[PDB]
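so ive been stuck on this for like two days lol. basically i have the seq below and the ligand is JXI, smiles is in there too. i just want the complex predicted, nothing fancy, no docking runs or whatever. if the output looks off dont worry ill sanity check it later, just need somthing to start from for the group meeting slides
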Amino acid sequence: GLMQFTLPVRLCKEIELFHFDIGPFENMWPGIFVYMVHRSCGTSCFELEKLCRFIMSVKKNYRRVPYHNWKHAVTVAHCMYAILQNNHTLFTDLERKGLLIACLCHDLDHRGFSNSYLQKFDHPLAALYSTSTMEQHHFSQTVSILQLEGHNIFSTLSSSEYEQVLEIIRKAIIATDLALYFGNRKQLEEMYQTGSLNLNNQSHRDRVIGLMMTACDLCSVTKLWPVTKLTANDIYAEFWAEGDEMKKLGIQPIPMMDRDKKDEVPQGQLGFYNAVAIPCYTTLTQILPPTEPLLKACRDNLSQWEKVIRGEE
Ligand SMILES: Cn1cc(-c2ccccc2)nc1/C=C/c1nc2c(cnn2C)c(=O)[nH]1
Ligand SMILES: [Mg+2]
Ligand SMILES: [Zn+2]
């Protein structure tokens, strides 16, 4: 186990900063993810032979959709990595493992369509799992992959270590359901401001890890303007597709998903940052101050949307 990964000096340096873009080179991403595993957890956390086969089974099962794809998976994994490196005493050796594996599997086998659209299309998955449909699907594929002859990266763990980490990953993936985020933050809000929040409380840790997971998923809004602007495209490319399929079911889609209502995007982005991203990072920073760069960035991008509305870009 004396193999390290190293990265070109520029990547080596930039990868530690929250706003790091993993670049257009698909071939390097798995290096970048192992790289984060080693520096974030240690060199013998996982057997390499096995991690390299688990990372590639994962890639294979993420489809070619505009946003909900392999680059997403990895972008989200780096952001949890960033979070963990800047808070390196608040997380256990099990939670540092699981959470990065969670982030890479958090959207396995996404089709590009929302839990809304499965249920109205009457997809089979919406029969097998009433709520958090996709997310429960994604956790299912994570464990599918894990039981493939050769792929069990957690092999070496004790019974309770292993049983615990699958329960960290399960709650982590399910907390990426943006439905479930609104309630979860407002609780962490009360708890923090009444000062009853306790990190030795397992039920509280969970809520917090959930907030981390939502902060990592939305991390497109914490990048430098041009990354965030170009990611927005890939996002609306999926929304409008799902909109086209709603129309085909005889259903008029919410303006967000209607491609005939492009013009009204600058406005709808505003609502989101105000209604979701700014609250999200605001709380996360009040709980974990070394994650301020995410809130500072997010506010910068809000400001840049403000400027798109005023015909200034
Ligand atoms: C709430 N919302 C409303 C609209 C919207 C409404 C009318 C016309 C055009 C757009 N656009 C959004 C934002 C969408 C969104 N942006 C996101 C997400 C992740 N990254 N970003 C920027 C996400 O999950 N949702
Ligand atoms: Mg998801
Ligand atoms: Zn995601």
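The chain has 14 helices and no strands. The chain has one domain: 28-310.
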